[PDB]
Ligand binder design. Structure first.
Ligand code: V14
Ligand code: V14
Ligand code: ZN
Ligand code: ZN
Lengths: 243, 251
């Protein structure tokens, strides 16, 4: 990865191991505000297998704030997952890897283009939530997982009805960890604000199997275990929005 | 534009009418303690006497332009380069700091303005989150002549006229700031002059810097501004926090 892109050897990369006892509580971290996320069924959205993940392109109007006047627009979401019972979250908590992880990528409203934002502090912000195994089938996730067979081939795509993107995220928007790092694939650009929800979302075992067994990647590989190894904090302190 | 007279500042720049402006009144009881706020770190601030620097009466303040290689970090991965410093002050028996603490205005204030290392130019940084960072310290009266400040203040007579400048030897720029880099307030706000762009990270030191009565009088009584007015009381009114939470690096 450093071979094909030197930025991946920077000092301040993602993902990282979260250690809640070492997190710094700041009461200045207010609840996340996410407006415009309740999409109607039409227009439909592009869902695509890009060889690294499944990506869902989001329309204009999904507004997000990390604080007063620190506003963002959602661009896309994608997921990270494992294989055959083995977990594939990117972030870990006290060394525990979760079954999967959802990432919603946003662009700061101070930047008109993603390419201006790359490498600039706070230019990009990702909301990250862990996916765990639960007893019930998750309705929000089923809308996407049920469409994966259609895009099983690397590079294929389809159109899916609009859905409540906020329904894919955990219950409490006031409880999260936050630090600054990087994209977890090339170009590994730094200055990305990562916000990792404390609470998780639950999908059924079948849903998780569907996530990790349907899509194919580059060559004849299954699209599985699409997570980067944990990176050192190098002095960065993870903040927490709760004591 | 000028202090206490037209043109309103919104008519110069719409950003001067933003919700999240500086300076602010720091109420430390309402400050949020955050232990992620580590000691500030400065590199390259101890300058050789040559090349000289340019000290300028710009009509709104006295500024010292800083050379390239002055690096400042707010934390791991939060790196900045110093551009310049300037001052805010009052007048005979009247304080003129920009920031206040529980309504108290200090005699004067130093600001060292920095540019994030993600940006090559100021104009790309303006209005971007964390693009600009300012270090701010209050100036109070102490019993001794401050030798670092004397290097600048002894040259103000040469630049009494609006728009005049003079060359001064390099000095230890960090000697114009408090020795305590651990204890500070930090919030997001704006430039306090047009264009009043937001996204500026303000760091205000707990510890103050001491100047003599004579030095403080020299600072407020020597310079002339726009017209035939004395350059005095060159501070912007405090702006409402409007929901922002000031952070503190100590409980
Ligand atoms: N974990 S991540 O958020 O850093 C990440 C991925 F892991 C990832 F696989 C992708 S991907 O779907 O696009 C495939 C590899 O690029 C994006 N996508 C982009 C989101 C838009 C921001 C601009 C930078 C490119 C990343 C991406 F941002
Ligand atoms: N208080 S402040 O830090 O927001 C401020 C001033 F009050 C001030 F008076 C000046 S000045 O002396 O240079 C007068 C012109 O405004 C600057 N200076 C500039 C620093 C360069 C980077 C930001 C653009 C313009 C302000 C300045 F940044
Ligand atoms: Zn991702
Ligand atoms: Zn200033």
């Amino acid at each position: 990865w450093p071979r094909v892109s030197p930025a991946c050897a920077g000092r301040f990369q993602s993902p990282v191991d979260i250690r809640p006892q070492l997190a710094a509580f700041s009461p200045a971290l207010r609840p996340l505000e996410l407006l415009g996320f309740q999409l109607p069924p039409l227009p439909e959205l592009r869902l695509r297998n890009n060889g690294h993940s499944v990506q869902l392109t989001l329309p204009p109007g999904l507004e997000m704030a990390l604080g007063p006047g620190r506003e963002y627009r959602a661009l896309q979401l994608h997921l990270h997952w494992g294989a055959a019972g083995r977990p594939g979250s990117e972030h870990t908590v006290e060394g525990h890897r979760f079954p999967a992880e959802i990432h919603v990528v946003h662009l700061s409203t101070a930047f008109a283009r993603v390419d201006e934002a790359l490498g600039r502090p706070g230019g990009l912000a990702v909301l990250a939530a862990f996916l765990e195994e639960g007893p019930e089938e998750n309705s929000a996730y089923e809308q996407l997982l049920s469409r994966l067979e259609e895009i099983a081939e690397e590079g294929s795509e389809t159109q899916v009805p609009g859905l409540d993107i906020s329904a894919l995220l955990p219950s409490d928007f006031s409880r999260y960890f936050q630090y600054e790092g990087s994209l977890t694939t090339p170009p590994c650009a730094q200055g990305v604000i990562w916000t990792v929800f404390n609470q998780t979302v639950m999908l059924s075992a079948k849903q998780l199997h569907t996530l990790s067994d349907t899509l194919w990647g580059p060559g004849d590989s299954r699209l599985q275990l699409n997570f980067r190894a944990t990176q050192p904090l190098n002095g960065r302190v993870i903040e927490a929005s709760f004591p």
